[PDB]
Symmetry: D2
Subunit: 268 residues, 4 copies
């Protein structure tokens, strides 16, 4: 079996492929039961959820690898991972990172040019080191760029093909506000484009149909479920503390039968 294959196959059977972030192994199983073909391990989520830390580069590759093992050990859905800038700097750092992640169970990962961003060149080597470190060719190397917002469209598209020439299997344009931009990246890069549809950002809540008219090959929802899980956990804590009992929040609680079924308790 090859998670890299499963991922590439998912984008093939679903367009745009809906990829939802799963904060932990339990939610990965839920996402599966909901019919999702692929999941995501958000870097911001590992920091905020697993570590209770802001997304300021305090988490480490190890924190990330732990969640990949937990998730991919029980959930077979191909897992797309946020590998940031490689957590290292040199070629062997990017390589060790890419191999670690793949070995942990990932199906794909994405590295970004955000140092402002790095030069086209340096990002080109970063991608080469990533592609070179890859053992399974089906493993997906995604290149995330923020050049559009930094250097402008022209420079953005230039990097696009540059990154693709280096071997990036897919592109991840960040902070896009207009579908047009997606079609352009698709027309130039000519590789599966990913639309990050996260909430409370500068991007509109595009629907799968809208994203399709723009040629988007993947629709990402990084923290969607996490944001809802926090609001509900907070409600439980709040009510329990005020009322001295959780009686009035039982109705918003997943039942046992539900928990057991989501984790195949009975089966064991």
């Amino acid at each position: 079996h090859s998670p890299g294959q499963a991922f590439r196959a998912a984008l093939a059977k679903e367009n745009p492929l809906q990829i939802v972030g799963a904060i932990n192994a339990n939610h990965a199983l839920l996402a599966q039961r909901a019919g999702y073909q692929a999941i995501y391990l958000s870097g911001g989520g590992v920091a905020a959820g697993s570590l209770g830390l802001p997304d300021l580069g305090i988490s480490t590759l190890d924190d990330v690898l732990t969640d990949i093992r937990r998730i991919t050990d029980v959930c077979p859905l191909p897992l797309l991972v946020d590998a940031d800038i490689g957590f290292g700097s040199s070629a062997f750092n990017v390589a060790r990172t890419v191999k670690s992640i793949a070995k942990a169970g990932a199906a794909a990962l994405h590295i970004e040019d955000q140092v402002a961003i790095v030069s086209k060149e340096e990002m080109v080597d970063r991608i080469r080191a990533a592609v070179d470190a890859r053992t399974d060719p089906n493993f997906v190397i995604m290149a995330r760029t923020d050049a559009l917002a930094v250097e402008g469209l022209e420079a953005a598209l230039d990097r696009a093909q540059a990154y693709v020439d280096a071997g990036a299997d897919m592109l991840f344009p960040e902070a896009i506000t207009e579908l047009s931009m997606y079609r352009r990246f698709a027309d130039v890069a000519q590789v599966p484009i990913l639309a990050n549809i996260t909430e409370f950002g500068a991007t509109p809540l595009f629907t799968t149909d809208e994203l399709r008219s723009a040629h988007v090959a993947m629709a990402l929802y990084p923290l969607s479920a996490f944001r809802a899980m926090n609001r509900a956990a907070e409600k439980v804590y709040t009510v329990l503390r005020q009322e001295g009992t959780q009686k009035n929040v039982i109705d918003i609680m997943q039942t046992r039968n539900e928990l057991y079924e989501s984790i195949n308790y009975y089966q064991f």
Copy 2:
């Protein structure tokens, strides 16, 4: 500063002391913000939450340690930990488990007498191996008994005495259904009594006022937040999968500002501004 001292100080300041489970570091910080004085690491939660596996002894000590460090590295609230039966059928194991758990940052832990449960003489030896291994005396060793699920109250009360004698700092009487049962353990054990007020169990949803009348020292809610977290998560998944958009789910989502405040984001930025 000791976490064990913090746990004990929490008890003296809140009676009964509400101890809520936090499935991860983020929720621990939420619990702290909600005003709680102590938190809990559920073994069933590590299994089902962190591993997505059933609570059937599949999780290892390492899975637990990882969650203990993550939680206690960012949240100062004393953490009570479910050490199951000691992770290891050997006395050596129990000792290494106790020391490792404390080192990971826990303030307390509870070890149980399950094998059906083991005999008194048996449980008494596990308790002794744990108290022996403990380096910091303030670190709490709570003794949990599941006798009430297959035995009568009297039988359960008997063990309670033997457990305390071995060195058990506190008692965790499982499956109690009558307020008076708590009172009897409190009067026989002579040490703080914890009441597991988890949902969908044989134990009624007793209120803090009810438990207080029964002389209960701690009120435990092991997976409460976790259960509501799962439902809401699923809701988002289902809708997003049916309507190809999360638009109709925005209203039940924690806002960016709320997320940032819970993890002290602005505070980190402040320190940078300072430089």
Copy 3:
């Protein structure tokens, strides 16, 4: 496929010398010395990585850490001592087998240790490991001590049963005569591993002698480790006694040798 590389080493070298590597650095020294397969001793993980006696105190986690460190830098197929599966439940053996393979190992062995469990008990453990296996090339070796315990009659029977159960190779403990390995090889009908550790009961059989015995693998679990400790103790002692390490400089690997062994310049080249 690490399992595929392990089987190819078996076919290429007969008997195949499998030396223990206490850590990633020694795995590279072994590789540079020409070895085709290495070993991760469970007794090594306890005494070396944890400083604890080999009495069941280490956990699967301690072992997975060493497997990753070793396989993340050394490509040689690694045979791992998995004891009895770490746990007691078929779920534990399966989770252990998968974990070990995922960590990067090429093979592992499990024993009928509880006195030894019953044949049926072991057979189930083996079946559990074989079914948990994802890569059919990943090797599952069955270690047994039936000979000493229950005698040859029962031992030879367990052997066949283990093989019928799915064991790719056999690791029969307590053998002191080549004629006995020969017998075990004929019965089992799968590669036999001979444990040539020192300070034990088994003679220090040579690769030639083992070959004449139909032995497929020669294992040296702690050999390098034993020597590294005596040398280390020597440095600690002299330095403490004399207030300088001047007189032990001659038994030390130089910095150039260390750099060379880990390919220092090829990395700095990338940088």
Copy 4:
């Protein structure tokens, strides 16, 4: 507390010999040999535990694992090589410092390497490390290679700034004269550590010599490790060339010596 134990060891021995222990087993050997403090070499974690060069490839997690393994079984206070803090920001330094203490370390040293950062940058790393520390007895050592990179003046200027910033002790590199060590001790006014590693440009100073130079600590980072690698290689080569280890039996630690060092019989 380990920090208390480290300072107690320093108070009772002059200079305090601190030998590196590559793993838990060697920590125990150092202990049986009479040492009162041991060290976890950063280059040792890389070359020994990871089989990689000391070029910034190891992560904080690799170091932490070794600290726990060693300190869980050996009570001798452990001085840890925290490199530059395993991160670029003060947040990384704080997380690194707390994690290392939590793992069981008694003290750590952080350096000004990047070329070296400006005096001001190092002053900030130290301040973050000092602020992150929860137990004042836990030692924060400042390591500097400014002597070789910038010269005497810059080195002494940095030293004083480092002490003013909160560094409990100083680890000045590249000193080749006992007389210069005295100068650093006099200007810095905090315990000075002298690195007596082999095959470098520095002399193999005896403890009596270091004492005359007012040196408070003598460090032997990989001494045992070096000898262990030569012996191990010897076994590997002879066994490969002769087809048996009969001829290297005489350089092997016996089963009883091993059992004795790990207290086998006691557990039994």
